[PDB]
Amino acid sequence: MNVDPHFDKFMESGIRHVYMLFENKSVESSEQFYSFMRTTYKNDPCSSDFECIERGAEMAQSYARIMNIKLE
Amino acid sequence: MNVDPHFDKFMESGIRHVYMLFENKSVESSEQFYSFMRTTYKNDPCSSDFECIERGAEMAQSYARIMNIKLE
Amino acid sequence: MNVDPHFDKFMESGIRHVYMLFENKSVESSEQFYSFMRTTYKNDPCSSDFECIERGAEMAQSYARIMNIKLE
Amino acid sequence: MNVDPHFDKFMESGIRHVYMLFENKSVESSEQFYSFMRTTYKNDPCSSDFECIERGAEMAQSYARIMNIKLE
Amino acid sequence: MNVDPHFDKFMESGIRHVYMLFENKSVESSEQFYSFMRTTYKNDPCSSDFECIERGAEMAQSYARIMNIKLE
Amino acid sequence: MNVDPHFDKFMESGIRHVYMLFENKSVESSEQFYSFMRTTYKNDPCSSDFECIERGAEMAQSYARIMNIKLE
Amino acid sequence: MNVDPHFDKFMESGIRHVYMLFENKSVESSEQFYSFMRTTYKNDPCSSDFECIERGAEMAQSYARIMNIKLE
Amino acid sequence: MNVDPHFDKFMESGIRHVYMLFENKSVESSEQFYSFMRTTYKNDPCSSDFECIERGAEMAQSYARIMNIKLE
Amino acid sequence: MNVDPHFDKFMESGIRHVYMLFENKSVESSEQFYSFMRTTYKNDPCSSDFECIERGAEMAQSYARIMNIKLE
Amino acid sequence: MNVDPHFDKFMESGIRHVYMLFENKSVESSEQFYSFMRTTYKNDPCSSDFECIERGAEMAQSYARIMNIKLE
Amino acid sequence: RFESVALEQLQIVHISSEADFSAVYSFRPKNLNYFVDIIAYEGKLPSTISEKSLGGYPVDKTMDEYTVHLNGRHYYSNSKFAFLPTKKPTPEINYMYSCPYFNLDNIYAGTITMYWYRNDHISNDRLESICAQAARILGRAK
Amino acid sequence: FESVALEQLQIVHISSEADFSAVYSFRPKNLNYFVDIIAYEGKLPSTISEKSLGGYPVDKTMDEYTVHLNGRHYYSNSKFAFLPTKKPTPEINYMYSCPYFNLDNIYAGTITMYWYRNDHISNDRLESICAQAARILGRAK
Amino acid sequence: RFESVALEQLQIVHISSEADFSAVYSFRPKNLNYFVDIIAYEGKLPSTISEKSLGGYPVDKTMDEYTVHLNGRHYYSNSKFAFLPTKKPTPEINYMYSCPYFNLDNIYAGTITMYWYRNDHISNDRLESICAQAARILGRAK
Amino acid sequence: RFESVALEQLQIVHISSEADFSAVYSFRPKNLNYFVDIIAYEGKLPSTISEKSLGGYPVDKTMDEYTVHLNGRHYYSNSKFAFLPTKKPTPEINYMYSCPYFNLDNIYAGTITMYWYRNDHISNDRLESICAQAARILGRAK
Amino acid sequence: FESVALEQLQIVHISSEADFSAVYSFRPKNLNYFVDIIAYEGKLPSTISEKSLGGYPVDKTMDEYTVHLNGRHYYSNSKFAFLPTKKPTPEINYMYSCPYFNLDNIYAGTITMYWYRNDHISNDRLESICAQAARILGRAK
Amino acid sequence: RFESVALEQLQIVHISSEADFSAVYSFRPKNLNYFVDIIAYEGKLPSTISEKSLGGYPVDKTMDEYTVHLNGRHYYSNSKFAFLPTKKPTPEINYMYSCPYFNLDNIYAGTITMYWYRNDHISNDRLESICAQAARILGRAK
Amino acid sequence: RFESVALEQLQIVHISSEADFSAVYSFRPKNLNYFVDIIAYEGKLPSTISEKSLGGYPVDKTMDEYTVHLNGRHYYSNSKFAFLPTKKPTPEINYMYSCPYFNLDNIYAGTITMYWYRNDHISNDRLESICAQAARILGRAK
Amino acid sequence: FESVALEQLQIVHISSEADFSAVYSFRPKNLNYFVDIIAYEGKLPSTISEKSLGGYPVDKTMDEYTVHLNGRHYYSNSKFAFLPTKKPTPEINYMYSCPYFNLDNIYAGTITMYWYRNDHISNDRLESICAQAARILGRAK
Amino acid sequence: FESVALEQLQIVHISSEADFSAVYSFRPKNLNYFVDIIAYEGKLPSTISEKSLGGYPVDKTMDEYTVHLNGRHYYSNSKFAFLPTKKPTPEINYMYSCPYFNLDNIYAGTITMYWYRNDHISNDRLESICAQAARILGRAK
């Protein structure tokens, strides 16, 4: 893929640690999650594997907590 | 990338064997070339590596000939 | 009325089994629903009462699903 | 049919008592007849079977007489 | 001329047997006639002299009838 | 053909006495030749077989000489 | 700011004495108010503090009255 | 003025330490200088008096050196 | 010619003393120059030879200065 | 005047020998006369004083005779 | 365009069905159907109608061809010719077979009709397939 | 082009002293199935009318069509090929026409003069009048 | 619009100058000036011209009013009436005074002219100011 | 329109293949493919998914169906169901067969997938032809 | 610009954990007589409404305006200068705002967070959240 | 688009006919046909022409292929190659078969031509059907 | 247009005021005013500036002419020449008088300035009226 | 008109065998203060360039202007009135020009041929070449 | 976007002190078969020209493409993958480039600096200059 590799690592970390635990997955839940992750990254891009994995998980977790998303 | 691998071989063969010989490369000439290759493929897609490579080179050659595009 | 009786059964079945469950009915939502049902029928018209009723309900359900239209 | 039932009774009476006797029926004779009957009704709609049948016949007859339409 | 000889016979037959009888010849009426004859031929071209002449006269007659064009 | 017969005689004379001897024939050489012959004629049309044949050959010859066109 | 000090007093007086009483403030109502105050000033500019303040309040009042703008 | 006070301090420092020494001042020299200073700041805004004064002077100086602007 | 002799002197003076020094003459630059000279004259026409010549040269100079047009 | 001097001589000859004798001069008579003279000249411009004077008078005279223009 | 499609489908129907006379009927006004026109035909006209009488014939909606079509079925008869533009019997016709067509707004817009002056005709199951296909295509054209 | 046709026909009409003059134009381009009167001067023949000046079918087997395609002018006392009526129109005593050819070198129409009276200027003079207009119309489109 | 401006300025000129007869002349065709029309007038027509003869008069550019105007000056005379649409002498006119006007494309487009049938007229310096102002305004209108 | 084409091709694939359950999967966002939706299905849903769980399932691009499709081949399995929107095993499925479709911009956009709850299915050479045709058509629709 | 404001405010709102957040925009350009809410997140204060989010008069003598023009962020327990109501709105316990400056370097609006509850994250954390959005909004128009 | 249709039809004709070399010829200027170009070909070029000589060849309208096409018939020969862009004989060609195509304005616009370097070719009735179909399609494309 | 209005008003101001040298100054960029240009002048340039130095001079907003103008008053001095594009003293100037102009968006956009190389100048009340009128007109032009 | 100018100049250039040929056009209409090269053939003189072909001031006192207004052609070994440079350009050995007049009968431009070499065909032949183009350009606008 | 590219490249060019700098852009979106120079500063290499800045084929097997897709900057003394010429261009002594990624997170082009001279500032300084521009260009479209 021609994807920004740091964004991809960040997003995949949020998906694999947080989004995958969403109880109610839908088109809308996925669209809202990507919107938050996309802008969070673009404001301040991570620049290493460790930072991208850590920040992707932490930011997705804050999103789920703050939005009161029901997890599994 | 997330690309159709048969189109990609078709296009890359056209590029590497014919488009790179175009005398006057431009945004316009590349757009018209891509438009012709994309539509030709979609009308009758190739489905194996060497078929795609042969057909892409021949269709790019046919394109240059029928459009009177200056080569070399 | 002077209506195609097979389209009428097709449409009425879609209305009575699916469209009436639309959460947000509007001029727009009814126009888009009618446009999809009309074109679907014309492409492959049903030709008996119970066939039209079965196909109309299923195609309206398929329409709601593929367009992510909120029901109930 | 979803037709105004009083207009329909009026029109059918004009057709059955007068138009059917036109010697030269054509697209144009039918279009001119409907135009006259349509506006005559809309100006002052009849509102009972008897009135619609009587007025439809009388008005069509006046139209044929005044326009000198050859009858059978 | 450099004309398709089968279209030319098709068109000339339509002209000589039907269009010349048009009551109201105009630029518009000739353009609409030519447009219908040209498209009809291209959809299903005739391929011999007497076939083209028969089909051209019949299609021009059919055209005048379906368009309610006044003749003679 | 519905062609101006004097232009046709003029052009054919230039083709048959001069253009046919061009060493490098191409779409572009043919387009440039016709452009010159077309305007040369239209400025001052020839009006007899002898004048058209003579002038067509002479003008094509001057064009080939002045433009330094390689002949056979 | 780099503002015309006489316009600024004129406008601020209109705002503080009249516009703040507008029942329905909106982008549109503020744009139309500013447009009227700007043009009125430019046509006949005030040139001292208390003159600008008096004229700005009176012209805003006149504006609300002539446009039937609901106040309070 | 309603100006960004950090940009203003940055710009004034570049003007007072560097631009004022330009030998050939013109509309064009001033427009080019502001263009460079504007984007330099917006990419990474200074946020204190000392940083703005220091960076404004240093960046204007680099601009004059790199562009070989004749000073007084 | 049938020209206003005072405009002609006004314009010719502007041309001969200023426009001929324009560094970048073009259709556009000549059209904008003529448009400014024509309107300036019409607003307040000169009415004797040496007045027209003096005012035309000065107004063309003023035009070049206010538009930052490169001279010589 | 920046006028074609041969046309001017031609026109003035037609005016002075023929148009000046028109009994009924009007905007329309003058417009029609100029229209005829303009195209007559442009089709085949005269190229000497004598030819322009002679042809201008002769052509204007033919115009007055053929159009039955009442002379003085 | 509708008129070219009507002529093409009528030709296909006439040839496939081996009918003696075939016609496209069209109702007017839209959604009211007070009049019917023969807008195109193939083969030999019945002796009871003429080229000059093809237009403006009144529709009797109480004829059962009208109701059968609105009930979703084709119509056939040896003697009842609802929209044939004559009040006279036409005993030269031995069989008619018709199917309705419905326009893009799903309204009954006319019929495609085949006629036989002879006693032998191909079977109704074949006529049904021939007519249904033509009516599907014509119903997409306008 | 329509302006050029009108201007040229006015000169043709006055210099030829004809009773009725017309510019004819063929359609469709290159195929010439129909002919229109696009400009006329003088008194319309009684057999035609303002409402019937366009869309007349071209019979390419008529002498005038084949003569023009041989590059020559045409004249006749009785044959009016492109005059937009099937009636004979005996009130016309003479017609003189010349073809014009468009910028693509294709036969595109005619310039024609008509006489109701029995006298007309010589063909040699008509030839020059027509040719001059034809060359100019031929360049106009 | 030009026509309203022409009429307004002619009225102003006629009243201010106290002339007996005043006219606006306009040349045609543009930039060629072969003909001249009286497009508007005030006061009483000279006996040598009529309402029906106001248009299409040939311009003699060798009359010195034409050359004086193109030299940038107003024109006056007791006997020479270049654009007055008659070849006859008009001895009832004792004085004429005219100024040219130039259109927005700076081309000589016509004149504003005053005439006296009496011997007394206001002085030329006043007529010059009256005419120059009207010609400036008319020259902006088209 | 894409949605009508998707539904038509899914019906053709389901009937031709004789599958028990068939689905069209669609990736989002474009060119990134982090989520996958079942946008249409035929037949009976597997017991491990529900109507309310058809959307927004995360794509694991390390599942070999994803890589096989990008290598230009169809995919089949008895146990691996990459985009089926459940983390649970689904042993009721005995066979899956899928082909990718690529949009008009030549990007991997989703799959057409057939499932069997029984052991007998028609041969892969037939499934390949059925799937390839549908994917060609769907790839032209958007 | 309106898309950028919405996207940036969503991040500001989630990361600050505020109860209500808004992007304010001044009009006319350079003069700042009026202020609009052009994007908001969370629950609108009871004192304002959807129909009243635009056209509110700017009082430039309010502390927030002068602090922003000194390039600093503003916070208060009671002063809500640009909140589009004259009422005091005591349900708000805290506001934190930062200015943004447009591409012409002019004070163009604010990014503001509000708390109805009595707890909020530290100003140091709010400062970073706001500044990041302000720099991006400042480049967007 | 015309160029894609030309290439597709040439491929179909070449494969169906089993020819050794096939070409699409195109005339210029429109409706005048003074020059002819090989715009596309399949198979091996004859030794008497080259890639650089495919354009701008003069049309000899007195060659009977030109007149046969305008008479409504296909053309074939063992030795006469009217539009092949060489004046040299080409004895390596044993057979040619061509059909004209006419554009949307019904004008002779070019040919579709098949060539054999061997003695065996499929029968003319098959070549006629192959060519006629391609020429019908190409004649609709521009 | 702004430029014609600027030149016209500068001429009026220069003639009415009887100044020796008059100029229109214009600030850039809009609403920021870091630079000032002499865009037009009348009379004789001071010896300390030149035709080539009229543009791009830095604005010192701490000069009191800038603050006086933003306080709503005209400015005058015998020695302080804020926007005159030289750092040198200019003792040849004995008096300056300036008024600000504000554009259609009500922003400080430049000045209209008069200079005297002699000691006698007309009184400030007259200069105020002359300047105020010109600045009102110029402030409407852009 | 621009197409006609290009087509006519190609014939002028080839038939005259000139080294450089140009069509000049005056602006504004009727006033002729400026002259542009709107079409050229051959090698541009070294003293002018593609970017400088328009907007050159017309000096109506130059001999070529007054000769053209007398309806005659102009030729010179050294005077190049409308060539858009003030430099003398000694590389030109000869110029020959003829005026054209537009449909309103106004002097509208020139057709000009230039020789860098010292030989050229006779003026009598140049006169016919120029006049033919001038008559056609004169009708084109 | 084109304005942002120009503004950012000016800062990149001045702060890096490069001899030639360019913003490259890939087409079609997501597929990157072609690369264009959409903005440049400094002196064009002798091997390329203004008329040849667009439509150059992308060879994705070149080291620069794979390094950028690993999220790292690229530098080389001899390999100029996207420079729109097949010639080696030995006059270039050094290139430094960094990728940018668009708002859809796709590799969309590069920011590249070139040195004809044999001295250049440190990669650490080039890295910061490039990254800052890349982040801003990445948000602009």
Side-chain angles (χ1 to χ4, degrees), chain Q residues 117-134:
Chain Q
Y117 304 132
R118 58 192 205 268
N119 284 326
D120 65 276
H121 59 81
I122 65 167
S123 56
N124 271 16
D125 62 294
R126 296 168 65 186
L127 296 177
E128 196 281 333
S129 177
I130 290 161
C131 283
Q133 185 173 45

PDB file of all heavy atoms in Angstrom, chain Q residues 117-134:
ATOM      1  N   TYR Q 117       8.584  74.548   0.804  1.00  0.00           N
ATOM      2  CA  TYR Q 117       9.996  74.895   0.891  1.00  0.00           C
ATOM      3  C   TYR Q 117      10.202  76.354   1.285  1.00  0.00           C
ATOM      4  O   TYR Q 117      11.347  76.790   1.449  1.00  0.00           O
ATOM      5  CB  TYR Q 117      10.685  74.635  -0.454  1.00  0.00           C
ATOM      6  CG  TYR Q 117      10.547  73.219  -0.970  1.00  0.00           C
ATOM      7  CD1 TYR Q 117      10.171  72.980  -2.283  1.00  0.00           C
ATOM      8  CD2 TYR Q 117      10.798  72.129  -0.151  1.00  0.00           C
ATOM      9  CE1 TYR Q 117      10.050  71.695  -2.775  1.00  0.00           C
ATOM     10  CE2 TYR Q 117      10.674  70.822  -0.636  1.00  0.00           C
ATOM     11  CZ  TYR Q 117      10.302  70.622  -1.951  1.00  0.00           C
ATOM     12  OH  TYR Q 117      10.172  69.350  -2.447  1.00  0.00           O
ATOM     13  N   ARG Q 118       9.121  77.111   1.410  1.00  0.00           N
ATOM     14  CA  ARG Q 118       9.118  78.506   1.820  1.00  0.00           C
ATOM     15  C   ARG Q 118       8.409  78.632   3.163  1.00  0.00           C
ATOM     16  O   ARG Q 118       7.796  77.687   3.657  1.00  0.00           O
ATOM     17  CB  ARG Q 118       8.426  79.379   0.768  1.00  0.00           C
ATOM     18  CG  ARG Q 118       7.000  78.955   0.486  1.00  0.00           C
ATOM     19  CD  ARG Q 118       6.442  79.643  -0.737  1.00  0.00           C
ATOM     20  NE  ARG Q 118       4.985  79.723  -0.684  1.00  0.00           N
ATOM     21  CZ  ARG Q 118       4.165  78.816  -1.205  1.00  0.00           C
ATOM     22  NH1 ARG Q 118       4.650  77.751  -1.827  1.00  0.00           N
ATOM     23  NH2 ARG Q 118       2.856  78.974  -1.101  1.00  0.00           N
ATOM     24  N   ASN Q 119       8.472  79.827   3.756  1.00  0.00           N
ATOM     25  CA  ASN Q 119       7.926  80.014   5.093  1.00  0.00           C
ATOM     26  C   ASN Q 119       6.445  80.351   5.093  1.00  0.00           C
ATOM     27  O   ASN Q 119       5.756  80.087   6.087  1.00  0.00           O
ATOM     28  CB  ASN Q 119       8.686  81.123   5.823  1.00  0.00           C
ATOM     29  CG  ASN Q 119      10.043  80.675   6.308  1.00  0.00           C
ATOM     30  OD1 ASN Q 119      10.229  79.521   6.688  1.00  0.00           O
ATOM     31  ND2 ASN Q 119      11.004  81.592   6.300  1.00  0.00           N
ATOM     32  N   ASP Q 120       5.938  80.928   4.014  1.00  0.00           N
ATOM     33  CA  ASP Q 120       4.544  81.339   3.956  1.00  0.00           C
ATOM     34  C   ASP Q 120       3.689  80.205   3.403  1.00  0.00           C
ATOM     35  O   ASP Q 120       4.018  79.613   2.369  1.00  0.00           O
ATOM     36  CB  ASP Q 120       4.381  82.599   3.103  1.00  0.00           C
ATOM     37  CG  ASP Q 120       4.727  82.369   1.633  1.00  0.00           C
ATOM     38  OD1 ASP Q 120       5.925  82.442   1.283  1.00  0.00           O
ATOM     39  OD2 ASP Q 120       3.798  82.111   0.828  1.00  0.00           O
ATOM     40  N   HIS Q 121       2.609  79.889   4.110  1.00  0.00           N
ATOM     41  CA  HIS Q 121       1.609  78.944   3.637  1.00  0.00           C
ATOM     42  C   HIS Q 121       0.240  79.439   4.084  1.00  0.00           C
ATOM     43  O   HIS Q 121       0.125  80.174   5.071  1.00  0.00           O
ATOM     44  CB  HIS Q 121       1.876  77.524   4.164  1.00  0.00           C
ATOM     45  CG  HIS Q 121       1.893  77.424   5.659  1.00  0.00           C
ATOM     46  ND1 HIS Q 121       0.741  77.333   6.412  1.00  0.00           N
ATOM     47  CD2 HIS Q 121       2.921  77.406   6.539  1.00  0.00           C
ATOM     48  CE1 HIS Q 121       1.061  77.268   7.692  1.00  0.00           C
ATOM     49  NE2 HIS Q 121       2.377  77.304   7.796  1.00  0.00           N
ATOM     50  N   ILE Q 122      -0.799  79.053   3.343  1.00  0.00           N
ATOM     51  CA  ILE Q 122      -2.141  79.467   3.748  1.00  0.00           C
ATOM     52  C   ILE Q 122      -2.521  78.785   5.060  1.00  0.00           C
ATOM     53  O   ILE Q 122      -1.913  77.797   5.491  1.00  0.00           O
ATOM     54  CB  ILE Q 122      -3.182  79.199   2.651  1.00  0.00           C
ATOM     55  CG1 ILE Q 122      -3.340  77.702   2.403  1.00  0.00           C
ATOM     56  CG2 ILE Q 122      -2.785  79.894   1.361  1.00  0.00           C
ATOM     57  CD1 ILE Q 122      -4.564  77.369   1.573  1.00  0.00           C
ATOM     58  N   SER Q 123      -3.532  79.340   5.715  1.00  0.00           N
ATOM     59  CA  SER Q 123      -3.779  79.007   7.109  1.00  0.00           C
ATOM     60  C   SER Q 123      -4.297  77.578   7.252  1.00  0.00           C
ATOM     61  O   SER Q 123      -4.871  76.994   6.326  1.00  0.00           O
ATOM     62  CB  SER Q 123      -4.765  80.004   7.718  1.00  0.00           C
ATOM     63  OG  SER Q 123      -5.963  80.030   6.964  1.00  0.00           O
ATOM     64  N   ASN Q 124      -4.085  77.015   8.444  1.00  0.00           N
ATOM     65  CA  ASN Q 124      -4.457  75.620   8.682  1.00  0.00           C
ATOM     66  C   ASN Q 124      -5.955  75.377   8.530  1.00  0.00           C
ATOM     67  O   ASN Q 124      -6.359  74.287   8.108  1.00  0.00           O
ATOM     68  CB  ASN Q 124      -3.998  75.180  10.069  1.00  0.00           C
ATOM     69  CG  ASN Q 124      -2.596  74.608  10.072  1.00  0.00           C
ATOM     70  OD1 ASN Q 124      -1.820  74.777   9.115  1.00  0.00           O
ATOM     71  ND2 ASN Q 124      -2.253  73.940  11.161  1.00  0.00           N
ATOM     72  N   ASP Q 125      -6.801  76.347   8.893  1.00  0.00           N
ATOM     73  CA  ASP Q 125      -8.235  76.118   8.734  1.00  0.00           C
ATOM     74  C   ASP Q 125      -8.602  75.907   7.268  1.00  0.00           C
ATOM     75  O   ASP Q 125      -9.496  75.110   6.960  1.00  0.00           O
ATOM     76  CB  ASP Q 125      -9.029  77.274   9.355  1.00  0.00           C
ATOM     77  CG  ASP Q 125      -8.758  78.602   8.684  1.00  0.00           C
ATOM     78  OD1 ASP Q 125      -7.613  79.091   8.794  1.00  0.00           O
ATOM     79  OD2 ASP Q 125      -9.688  79.162   8.050  1.00  0.00           O
ATOM     80  N   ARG Q 126      -7.904  76.588   6.351  1.00  0.00           N
ATOM     81  CA  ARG Q 126      -8.124  76.352   4.927  1.00  0.00           C
ATOM     82  C   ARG Q 126      -7.531  75.015   4.493  1.00  0.00           C
ATOM     83  O   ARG Q 126      -8.159  74.270   3.732  1.00  0.00           O
ATOM     84  CB  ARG Q 126      -7.525  77.490   4.107  1.00  0.00           C
ATOM     85  CG  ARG Q 126      -8.186  78.830   4.365  1.00  0.00           C
ATOM     86  CD  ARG Q 126      -7.368  79.954   3.742  1.00  0.00           C
ATOM     87  NE  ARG Q 126      -7.354  79.844   2.285  1.00  0.00           N
ATOM     88  CZ  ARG Q 126      -6.627  80.618   1.482  1.00  0.00           C
ATOM     89  NH1 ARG Q 126      -5.838  81.557   1.992  1.00  0.00           N
ATOM     90  NH2 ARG Q 126      -6.680  80.440   0.167  1.00  0.00           N
ATOM     91  N   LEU Q 127      -6.320  74.704   4.956  1.00  0.00           N
ATOM     92  CA  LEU Q 127      -5.713  73.419   4.622  1.00  0.00           C
ATOM     93  C   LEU Q 127      -6.572  72.266   5.126  1.00  0.00           C
ATOM     94  O   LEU Q 127      -6.698  71.239   4.447  1.00  0.00           O
ATOM     95  CB  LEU Q 127      -4.306  73.317   5.205  1.00  0.00           C
ATOM     96  CG  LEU Q 127      -3.291  74.320   4.661  1.00  0.00           C
ATOM     97  CD1 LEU Q 127      -1.961  74.158   5.372  1.00  0.00           C
ATOM     98  CD2 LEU Q 127      -3.132  74.101   3.161  1.00  0.00           C
ATOM     99  N   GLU Q 128      -7.185  72.424   6.305  1.00  0.00           N
ATOM    100  CA  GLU Q 128      -8.033  71.362   6.850  1.00  0.00           C
ATOM    101  C   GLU Q 128      -9.215  71.090   5.929  1.00  0.00           C
ATOM    102  O   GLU Q 128      -9.520  69.935   5.614  1.00  0.00           O
ATOM    103  CB  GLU Q 128      -8.523  71.737   8.251  1.00  0.00           C
ATOM    104  CG  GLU Q 128      -9.091  70.554   9.074  1.00  0.00           C
ATOM    105  CD  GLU Q 128     -10.523  70.153   8.723  1.00  0.00           C
ATOM    106  OE1 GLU Q 128     -11.305  71.004   8.241  1.00  0.00           O
ATOM    107  OE2 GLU Q 128     -10.881  68.976   8.966  1.00  0.00           O
ATOM    108  N   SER Q 129      -9.876  72.151   5.463  1.00  0.00           N
ATOM    109  CA  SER Q 129     -11.025  71.971   4.581  1.00  0.00           C
ATOM    110  C   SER Q 129     -10.606  71.336   3.254  1.00  0.00           C
ATOM    111  O   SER Q 129     -11.282  70.424   2.750  1.00  0.00           O
ATOM    112  CB  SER Q 129     -11.721  73.316   4.365  1.00  0.00           C
ATOM    113  OG  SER Q 129     -12.792  73.180   3.450  1.00  0.00           O
ATOM    114  N   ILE Q 130      -9.478  71.785   2.692  1.00  0.00           N
ATOM    115  CA  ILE Q 130      -8.979  71.237   1.431  1.00  0.00           C
ATOM    116  C   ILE Q 130      -8.684  69.751   1.575  1.00  0.00           C
ATOM    117  O   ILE Q 130      -9.096  68.934   0.742  1.00  0.00           O
ATOM    118  CB  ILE Q 130      -7.722  72.003   0.978  1.00  0.00           C
ATOM    119  CG1 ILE Q 130      -8.090  73.416   0.528  1.00  0.00           C
ATOM    120  CG2 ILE Q 130      -6.978  71.216  -0.130  1.00  0.00           C
ATOM    121  CD1 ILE Q 130      -6.919  74.369   0.504  1.00  0.00           C
ATOM    122  N   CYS Q 131      -7.967  69.387   2.644  1.00  0.00           N
ATOM    123  CA  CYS Q 131      -7.564  67.997   2.852  1.00  0.00           C
ATOM    124  C   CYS Q 131      -8.744  67.104   3.175  1.00  0.00           C
ATOM    125  O   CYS Q 131      -8.857  65.988   2.646  1.00  0.00           O
ATOM    126  CB  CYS Q 131      -6.556  67.924   3.988  1.00  0.00           C
ATOM    127  SG  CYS Q 131      -5.018  68.446   3.436  1.00  0.00           S
ATOM    128  N   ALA Q 132      -9.622  67.568   4.062  1.00  0.00           N
ATOM    129  CA  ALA Q 132     -10.759  66.757   4.469  1.00  0.00           C
ATOM    130  C   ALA Q 132     -11.630  66.390   3.278  1.00  0.00           C
ATOM    131  O   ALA Q 132     -12.090  65.248   3.171  1.00  0.00           O
ATOM    132  CB  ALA Q 132     -11.574  67.493   5.534  1.00  0.00           C
ATOM    133  N   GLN Q 133     -11.858  67.339   2.364  1.00  0.00           N
ATOM    134  CA  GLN Q 133     -12.681  67.039   1.198  1.00  0.00           C
ATOM    135  C   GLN Q 133     -12.019  65.992   0.308  1.00  0.00           C
ATOM    136  O   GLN Q 133     -12.664  65.031  -0.130  1.00  0.00           O
ATOM    137  CB  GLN Q 133     -12.950  68.317   0.414  1.00  0.00           C
ATOM    138  CG  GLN Q 133     -13.895  68.098  -0.747  1.00  0.00           C
ATOM    139  CD  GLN Q 133     -14.287  69.406  -1.393  1.00  0.00           C
ATOM    140  OE1 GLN Q 133     -13.440  70.264  -1.638  1.00  0.00           O
ATOM    141  NE2 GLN Q 133     -15.579  69.578  -1.648  1.00  0.00           N
ATOM    142  N   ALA Q 134     -10.725  66.152   0.041  1.00  0.00           N
ATOM    143  CA  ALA Q 134     -10.027  65.188  -0.802  1.00  0.00           C
ATOM    144  C   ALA Q 134     -10.005  63.810  -0.159  1.00  0.00           C
ATOM    145  O   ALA Q 134     -10.181  62.795  -0.845  1.00  0.00           O
ATOM    146  CB  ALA Q 134      -8.609  65.662  -1.083  1.00  0.00           C
TER     147      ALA Q 134
END
